Amino acid sequence: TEQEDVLAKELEDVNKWGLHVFRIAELSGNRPLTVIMHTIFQERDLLKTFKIPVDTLITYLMTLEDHYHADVAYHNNIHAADVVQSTHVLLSTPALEAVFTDLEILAAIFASAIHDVDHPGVSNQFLINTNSELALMYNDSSVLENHHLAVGFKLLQEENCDIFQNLTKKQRQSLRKMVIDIVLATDMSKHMNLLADLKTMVETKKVTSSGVLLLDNYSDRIQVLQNMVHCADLSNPTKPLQLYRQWTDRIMEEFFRQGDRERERGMEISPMCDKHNASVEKSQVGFIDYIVHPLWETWADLVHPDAQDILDTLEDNREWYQSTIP
Ligand SMILES: CCOC(=O)c1c(C)n[nH]c1C
Ligand SMILES: [Mg+2]
Ligand SMILES: [Zn+2]
């Protein structure tokens, strides 16, 4: 049908920053994670490399996607698809050419796909403050992130869902460890420490004559993968403005809903969650200045000059949001 043809055409931009992910979500019947993951797995020849049966991949992807909440405005299957595709583009950076193995590539992409699964639309701090069952289970540390991992891995056990069935025991152990290390690193409470270590690597950077990064041990390799997926997670402000604005509307909706729950419970309303006392534009400029730009400028230095266009877009968007403040 016409819908299928237009979807296929939009998916031709899968290797580009600024993919029309919302349009893909609409055209696919709200299956952006399934179609984008499938497209990327075919593009990178991952099904053949890891002997993943196509039916198994689609079954797992659809099940995983079903565990993202359709009533959560930001932390849903569209965000997951976006982080997956963003990681996919970052992995193709010329400075990282042939740096990571196929298993490491698989781990980064899989981690991106499951990284927010079953997100309830409220923060770790909210879960801790409300004495939730999740915070009790996880002892207040990386509560959501531990849960996303547990669900992502548990779903592999469903009927015809083990996409890693033909990996060796060693490969399965290695992939699991890498995925856990990556998703736990998406917890924002770990941002400052991750950035500090990324800055240290940039200062002690070792490269070939062409500018390709030389990473030998696991500690350095996983650190780059952790920061890569963290950058992908925090990539909305670096995308074309039309996309960024849509992501902002979505996170503000989610935040305001959390603030409504806090207000009625007599709790202090979390930053950016009070719909009656919000400054959306000022908050975006602040988030770029204090979190997103420091991170992306450091990533840009690591892969210089491959991320210049991304950094340029970030700065363009910061300038535009600032202009909306009288
Ligand atoms: C698109 C704008 O996103 C944010 O402001 C934001 C913050 C702050 N925390 N998480 C997100 C996604
Ligand atoms: Mg998360
Ligand atoms: Zn996320």
UniProtKB/Swiss-Prot annotation:
Active-site residues, Swiss-Prot/TrEMBL: H75
Domain PDEase, first and last residues per copy: 1-326
Binding site for Mg(2+): D116
Localization in the cell: Apical cell membrane; Cytoplasm; Membrane; Cytoplasm, Cytoskeleton
UniProt binding sites for Zn(2+) 1: H79, H115, D116, D233
UniProt modification remark: Long isoforms that share a conserved PKA phosphorylation site in the N-terminus are activated by PKA through phosphorylation. Isoform 3 and isoform 7 are activated by phosphorylation (in vitro), but not isoform 6. Sumoylation of long isoforms by PIAS4 augments their activation by PKA phosphorylation and represses their inhibition by ERK phosphorylation.
Tissue occurrence: Expressed in colonic epithelial cells (at protein level). Widespread; most abundant in skeletal muscle.
Residues bound to AMP: H75, D116, D233, N236, Q284, F287
Outcome after substituting D140R: Abolishes homodimerization
Subunit annotation: Homodimer for the long isoforms. Isoforms with truncated N-termini are monomeric. Isoform 3 is part of a ternary complex containing PRKAR2A, PRKAR2B and AKAP9. Interacts with PDE4DIP. Identified in a complex composed of RYR1, PDE4D, PKA, FKBP1A and protein phosphatase 1 (PP1). Isoform 5, isoform N3 and isoform 12 bind RACK1 via their unique N-terminus. Binds ARRB2. Interacts (via N-terminal region) with SHANK2 (via proline-rich region); the interaction is increased in a PKA-dependent manner.
Family named by the database record: Belongs to the cyclic nucleotide phosphodiesterase family. PDE4 subfamily.
The protein's name in its UniProt record: 3',5'-cyclic-AMP phosphodiesterase 4D
Taxonomy of the source species: Eukaryota, Metazoa, Chordata, Craniata, Vertebrata
Residues of the whole record sequence present: 388 to 713 of 809
